[PDB]
Amino acid sequence: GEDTWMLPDVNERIEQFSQEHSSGVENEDQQEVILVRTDQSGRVWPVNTKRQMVSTHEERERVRYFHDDDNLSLNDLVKNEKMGTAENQNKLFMRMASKFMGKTDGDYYTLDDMFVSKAAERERLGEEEENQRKKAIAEHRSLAAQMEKCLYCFDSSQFPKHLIVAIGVKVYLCLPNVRSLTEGHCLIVPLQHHRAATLLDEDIWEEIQMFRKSLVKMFEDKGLDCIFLETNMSMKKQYHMVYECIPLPKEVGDMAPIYFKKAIMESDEEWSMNKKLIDLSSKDIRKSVPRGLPYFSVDFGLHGGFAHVIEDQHKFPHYFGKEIIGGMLDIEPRLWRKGIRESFEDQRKKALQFAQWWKPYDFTKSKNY
C-alpha cells in the first residue's frame, strides 16, 4: 500500500476540489517550453528572438565606444533596464580573461586601453546567441533537474505523499523525511518553487500566516512553544521553500531569544559589510530584507525574531537553525546533518498521531458537520 495510503482528511479535501468539476520554442524531447529568464530580483520575463576592429572612430574624432550604441532608441534603454541582465560586467571581463593578451605594462596600455580596444562587435548577432544559450537552456535544465529530484514539488519522482496532513489552497503542511528532530516537527511548504518568502506574493504569505497562527495555538494548549525557521541559501541552486516549525518545551523556549542572539553575531565573517543581526520584531521579513539576496530568518511563536543576510555561503551551514536547537535540547549530531532515514512505510505512520492533534484546529475546510 506504499503507492496508495494517505490520511482520510487529506483525501476528503481532494474530493472537495474534485466536486468543483460537477518567441522561442525549445522542443525539450517532446514538449514545448517557452523561453524565460530570471533576474537577480526573481522576476520572470520572456526571452525574445571579418573583424576589421570596427570603425570605432570618425575623422580624427571619437563618436562611439560600442558598435551598436547608435541604434538604441530612448525607450529601448528603458525597457531593457527594467528587465536586464544580472550583471553585464563580466562578459567583457571573461573575454579579456582569456590568455595571450600580453600584459598591461603600467602606463601606455592600461586595462582601460585594453577594454576600449576589446569593445569591437561580436560576430553576427553573437551577443544575442550567447545570451539565448545562457538565459534559456541553462536555467530551464537546472530548474527541471531540481524539479525532478524535488521532495516538496507536488507531483515529482520521490514525493512521500502520506506525510501530508493539511492542504489549504496554495500551501500545505508536511512532516519531515527523516527521524524528526523533536516530537511534533512539522513543515509549512508552498506548492510551487518560490525559493524565498520575499519572493512570494501577498495571498500566499497571508495563507502561510494562517497556518503559522494556528500551529502556535495547538502547541500552546499542550504547554509547548514554537520556533519557525527559514533558511534561504544562494539563489542559484533553486531549492524549494520550506518554513519549519520545531516545538520544544516552555522551560527552554524562554531561553531561545538569548541563544540565537549569541550565535548569529558569531555565525559568519568577522569584518562583515552588512551589519549582522537584523531585528524583525516590528517591521517583519517582507520589508526588512531586500528582494533577491540570501538570508536566514528566525521567528519565536507569534513575535518575530531576527534575520541575517548571509554572505560567503561556504562558511554558513544550511543546517544552522537546527544545530542551535539540537545543542540546547542535547540531541546527538546525526539528527540534523544529513538526517537519519526511517522505515519507509512503518515508522512514517507518525501522521496518525499528528492528525489527531490537529483535528480541532483544522481551518482548511468548512465541511465539518
Partner: protein, 56 residues
C-alpha cells in the same frame, strides 16, 4: 566516547576554513570526517582496533 569524538573532528575541520580549493588528500580527509559524524559507532570501533593492533 561520542562526546570526545565530536570535539576531535571539530578541531580537525578547522584546518580547512581557509579555502575551497582542495587537493586529493584533503578531499579524502573530509570524506572520512563526514562518515564519522554519520555513524559514530563505526569510527569508535575502528579507532579502538588501531590502538590494540597497529604498530607500523
Amino acid at each position: 566516547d561520542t562526546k570526545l569524538l565530536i570535539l576531535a573532528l571539530e578541531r580537525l575541520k578547522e584546518a580547512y576554513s581557509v579555502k575551497s580549493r582542495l587537493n586529493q588528500s584533503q578531499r579524502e580527509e573530509l570524506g572520512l570526517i563526514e562518515q564519522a559524524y554519520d555513524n559514530p559507532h563505526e569510527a569508535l570501533s575502528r579507532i579502538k582496533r588501531h590502538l590494540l593492533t597497529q604498530r607500523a
